């Protein structure tokens, strides 16, 4: 008999994720079916999105050789039936207060910072770059969390040193770039560009650095279709472009310029679920039909 979710203490909520205390040394990391676009959590959930993204994360943890916070199998008996397939039992860590971001391509706030200053997070870049320019080598572009409705603020390496220590900052930088490089190469081999990615790390009792969040999901990372990669224009979101196009199209009745957006057409939600499955199966070489669920 699996426990009820109500047996555990809710300790944190994100836009589309939840965190629960299981015991003194373990948490339950829960992905929901909610989806965010234009910094709004949309009214309409995407069926199986939580399960698909959990499957993705589990695959990438297995691909990487670095210590991670997984503390049991996807069907661990401590996982409630209600969240089976979209929840992971993890080890409690002392989390480091740094959003560890790697960018292989220049877009979003990285692009904006570059267009404003010529630099991103302390990195002075060549002149002449633009939207979706390839960065080589990938950049460590750390950020810190701000207030509830605010975007993370980009910071430089010295800021990271000030947050975690000089040696630890080096370690975060090196591991972030190494992990991103490995996963990006794997994905691209399968036809998907991982343009960038965001990690959080924590520290265990012995002082070891442990990867601890979700890793390389389309929420934590920009997924692009490599077959349509065209530098100089904004790349379609592999998973969210249908959602984006409808919301800003002639059928939504919504002006993006910060009214809460309307619910999505069922057809758009279903199409979106399909894109998540496509991305998962291509990258993992596995079938989502095999992934556990209620
Ligand atoms: C910000 C992020 C979060 C995730 C899910 C929902 C809301 C927030 N978070 C992660 C921890 C955390 N703390 C201790 N040990 C861990 N292994 C983890 C993890 N993962 C605390 N917060």
Swiss-Prot record:
Which is a Gene Ontology cellular component entry for this protein? cytoplasm
Copy the pathway line from the protein's UniProt record: Purine metabolism; IMP biosynthesis via de novo pathway; 5-amino-1-(5-phospho-D-ribosyl)imidazole-4-carboxamide from 5-amino-1-(5-phospho-D-ribosyl)imidazole-4-carboxylate: step 1/2
UniProtKB keywords: ATP-binding, Ligase, Nucleotide-binding, Purine biosynthesis
Reactions the enzyme catalyzes = 5-amino-1-(5-phospho-D-ribosyl)imidazole-4-carboxylate + L-aspartate + ATP = (2S)-2-[5-amino-1-(5-phospho-beta-D-ribosyl)imidazole-4-carboxamido]succinate + ADP + phosphate + 2 H(+)
Q: Which InterPro entries match?
A: SAICAR_synt/ADE2_N (IPR028923), SAICAR_synth (IPR001636), SAICAR_synthetase_CS (IPR018236)
Question: Looking at the record's lineage, which domain of life comes first?
Answer: Bacteria
GO terms, biological process: 'de novo' IMP biosynthetic process
Q: Return the CDD domains for the record.
A: SAICAR_synt_Sc (cd01414)
Q: Name one GO molecular function term.
A: ATP binding
Q: Name one Pfam family in it.
A: SAICAR_synt
Please tell me which top-level EC class this enzyme sits in. ligase
Supply the EC number(s).
6.3.2.6
User: Cross-referenced PANTHER family, in alphabetical order?
Assistant: PHOSPHORIBOSYLAMINOIMIDAZOLE-SUCCINOCARBOXAMIDE SYNTHASE
UniProt lists the family membership as follows: Belongs to the SAICAR synthetase family.
The name under which this protein is listed is: Phosphoribosylaminoimidazole-succinocarboxamide synthase
Native source organism of the sequence: Mycobacteroides abscessus (strain ATCC 19977 / DSM 44196 / CCUG 20993 / CIP 104536 / JCM 13569 / NCTC 13031 / TMC 1543 / L948)
